Design a protein around this ligand. Structure first.
Ligand SMILES: [Zn+2]
Ligand SMILES: [Zn+2]
Length: 214
């Protein structure tokens, strides 16, 4: 397995890539800085990689102040248990926490009930477009940077794992997301290369295509 990668996207924004009878999953997340405080957008795909990530940031002088997981699957949440052990505030939607609990997995400490939620006002915003990749999937918007983290919902190449997906809802959800974040300069996804707002349209096309095929 390749090692955890941390790559600066721009001032205050880093992409973390971690890796895990299939084969090997590549998983992108972000770390976002508010002054010297760092916030994980999705944990790495393992607890060990979450520890490595946190340590890298600590060793560069940043305080890890919180993490937000975009859906209940391990690739967004693997590190929550370890983060809780460090007294690092973990966040997930109430639906995501309910699905974690249902799977006997460790829950985020903090949660939120709304479709729209500000983790930090004007800097890190959370939005639920509706079901797609999973029932609970949310996206994270960085207004100051015009960057959207779409997690496992933006799937401009193919929809990937359908095991917990809602094929009938995904096209509508995807249109909702396109309408809301046409303003996005960059769209960062869990499993594809970084692009612009057109990846939202690509995702809608893949959702339509995939629903037809079912
Ligand atoms: Zn997933
Ligand atoms: Zn995924």
């Amino acid at each position: 397995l390749p090692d955890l990668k941390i790559e600066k996207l721009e001032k205050g924004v880093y992409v973390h890539t971690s890796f895990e009878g299939w084969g090997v999953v590549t998983k992108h997340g972000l770390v976002v800085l508010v002054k010297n405080d760092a916030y994980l957008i999705d944990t790495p795909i393992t607890a060990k990689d979450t520890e490595k990530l946190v340590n890298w940031f600590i060793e560069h002088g940043y305080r890890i102040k919180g993490s937000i997981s975009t859906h209940f699957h391990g690739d967004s949440t693997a590190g929550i248990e370890w983060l809780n052990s460090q007294s690092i505030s973990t966040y997930a939607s109430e639906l995501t926490n309910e699905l974690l609990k249902k799977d006997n997995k460790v829950q985020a400490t903090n949660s939120f009930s709304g479709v729209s939620y500000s983790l930090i006002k004007n800097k890190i915003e959370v939005f639920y477009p509706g079901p797609g990749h999973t029932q609970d999937n949310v996206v994270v918007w960085l207004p100051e940077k015009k960057i959207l983290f779409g997690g496992c919902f933006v799937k401009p190449d193919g929809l990937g794992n359908l095991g917990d997906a809602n094929l009938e809802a995904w096209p509508k959800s995807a249109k909702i997301l396109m309408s809301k974040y046409g303003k996005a300069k960059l769209v960062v996804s869990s499993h594809s290369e970084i692009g612009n707002a057109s990846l939202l349209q690509r995702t809608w096309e893949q959702a339509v295509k995939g629903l037809n095929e079912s």
